[PDB]
Design a protein around this ligand. Sequence first.
Ligand SMILES: [Cl-]
Ligand SMILES: [Cl-]
Length: 162
Amino acid sequence: MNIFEMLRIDEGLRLKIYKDTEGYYTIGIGHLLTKSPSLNAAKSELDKAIGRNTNGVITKDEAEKLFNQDVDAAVRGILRNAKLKPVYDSLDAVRRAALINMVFQMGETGVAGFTNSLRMAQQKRWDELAVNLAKSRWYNQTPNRAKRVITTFRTGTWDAYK
Ligand SMILES: [Cl-]
Ligand SMILES: [Cl-]
């Protein structure tokens, strides 16, 4: 188990433009295209992202390329963030995967805001972190995925994914 396999399970793979759980136009492996209510705008972004006239449909290979770029950006976003970097540095490999997953899903800025949980994570207070993470919109909107990430963070093992 690794971050790639972990996110591929959490996000699935879709080759045609679709709406995410928030209702945003997405594609591939959780690749958000735009928050705008327009499919054309989505198609525009899609074509610009892929570099060809796609017509709202891509290949597996294209989905995987977007996915590689997105995981990479998530990591780099973490390392560049003053609030996140130190948390990350202090964690074991499994738990880093948990943090990366949250970032990929909610953006750096979003996670950077979980002030209290970041502190608990840093103090390695696992059970408390788990409780605190659960009191969030994130958990209430996507509970199964959230439970998976939380267990990973709490336990430091890949059990929730096995
Ligand atoms: Cl892009
Ligand atoms: Cl869910």
